[PDB]
């Protein structure tokens, strides 16, 4: 298992705009388009990421180039932010894994504020962490996703994405 196959399992895969579990048009793998509730907008936006005159439709070959984007800016994002890079760095490979998953899912930003969680981590204080983290509205909205991220943090394997 690993990053890409990690969310791809939690993002799933569609070739034609739709809206996700907050109501925000998207594309492909979780590729957010906009938080503006016109499909124009949407459409406009996907036309500029993917460089053509789409009409809301976008091939495989598409939708995992802008993955790869994605996920590589989240990688990015870890490294970079202020808050995060000291966290990242001390985390093995398998929680590195979740802790990028949940940048992508939330920015660099949502994440650096996860701040007494990120501490935790960052001790290595697993169980701790696991039902901090889950006192969150990240949690409540999105329960199952947020549990195979949480039990991935607790126990550093891949077991919740089998
Ligand atoms: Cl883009």
Known sequence: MNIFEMLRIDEGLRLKIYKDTEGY????????????????????????????????????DEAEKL???????????????????????????????????????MGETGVAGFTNSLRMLQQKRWDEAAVNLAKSRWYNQTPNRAKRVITTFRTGTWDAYK
């Open 67 to 105: 993955f790869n984007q994605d996920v590589d800016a989240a990688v990015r994002g870890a490294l970079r932010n202020a808050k995060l890079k000291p966290v990242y760095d001390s985390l093995d490979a398998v929680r590195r894994a979740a802790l990028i998953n949940m940048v992508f899912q």
């Open 25 to 60: 048009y998207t594309i492909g793998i979780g590729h957010l388009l906009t938080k503006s509730p016109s499909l124009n907008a949407a459409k406009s936006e996907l036309d500029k990421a993917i460089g053509r005159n789409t009409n809301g439709v976008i091939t495989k």
